[model samples]
Target: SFSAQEREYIRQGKEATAVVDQILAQEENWKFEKNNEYGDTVYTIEVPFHGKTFILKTFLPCPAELVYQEVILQPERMVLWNKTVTACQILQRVEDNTLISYDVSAGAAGGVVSPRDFVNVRRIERRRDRYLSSGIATSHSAKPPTHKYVRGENGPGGMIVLKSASNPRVCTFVWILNTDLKGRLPRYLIHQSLAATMFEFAFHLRQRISELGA
Candidate 1:
């Protein structure tokens, strides 16, 4: 039960989640990238307009609900676990599963990537036994851009945390990262940082989850 005003944003979020299945079904075209410290495989693929796409495939001993609570339900607490995120908060809450958020990163990829900010609409939904979180860059009149950091764009992609069909003890996390850090930085540098950042995200998230009783 959501207000009519939220219909458009929710639709956008659903599309983002819908495309994730198509993104992951591919067994080819994605170039194998790095394996981070957690042994999570990072893959890259070039898309027409979205630039390079980064994929992080990993499994954690957690439930889909647990991942959703940490990622979408609690943006304000991100600073405690995610070190890269220096600042993050919900700018507007559309409903129980949708909201507009702002985030600032200290740096990424050994500081090669400059600090950047994101204003986006994040939506969470339960599909089957999976939790789908999708973020799309957006602009709000009250939260205009600032000069403190480069305004980064979070393109159509986010996280898919679902129960592993083969192993119910763990959930599969697939992060489809597509972002544009608007600046003069080289593409290679940005990609390097993004891949590492994605790994760091999963690593720290697991650590944080361990702190909980689950």
Candidate 2:
């Protein structure tokens, strides 16, 4: 039997996933950003709530299955792939598919680059040909138990959808992120920060594929 807190967590996860679904269905009103050096596409749209922004990114990588396992399935690997992710701690495990985490991000040298933190409930849905990983920032104390960074209040979060590419040997990975550049950060800085992270993910993903293939 599920406790009240557990049921509440589940409800929040479903709500977050629904937000992502709605975003993916939106095709109009998005502004296209320049393609990445690696040829992947990028796009952005204004988020309805709070006048924030959301990023839509697509990456083509070999063997989507491999990306799913190496990137999506393994949170531990993100420390190496994304320099901004300084810390990630699983706060609660609702079940195999749902959990709560406290994550911290900052500069590569540990300085305050885009120093930000999130306490989120993340849910994973796996279908035969695709996977959806969604999350939403939730309310937590100013200081969480096992984290060194300051806890951020509830804010924007989104999902990543990984699907099989037209060619079976590769895959199409799309990421949707709702981010708010609150405080004094400029709009360009916010876009740059998110773009840099997405590019870095693709870079590390290709590197992993090569190592695995070799």
- Output the number of the TM-score-best candidate: 1
Q: What is the lDDT of residue 207 in candidate 2?
A: 72
lDDT (Cα, tens digit) per residue for candidate 2, span 1-214: 8998888888888887777777677757667875776776667766667344446465554766776776567776667655557777777878788878777766522232446777788788887777777787765454353444444444444546456546777777777766553446566765676677666666766676777888
Model 2, total clashes: 0
What TM-score against the true fold does each predicted structure earn?
A: 0.88, 0.82
| lDDT of each candidate versus the true structure | 0.79, 0.66
What are the per-residue Cα lDDT tens digits for candidate 1 across 121-213? Answer: 877777776877787787777678888888999877788787667766678888888999978888888888888888888888888878875
Superposition TM-score, candidate 2 onto the true structure: 0.82
| Model 1 worst lDDT window (10 residues) | 18-27
The residue pairs that clash in candidate 2, if any, are none
Stretches off by above 4 angstroms in model 2 are 108-112, 140-150, 153-161
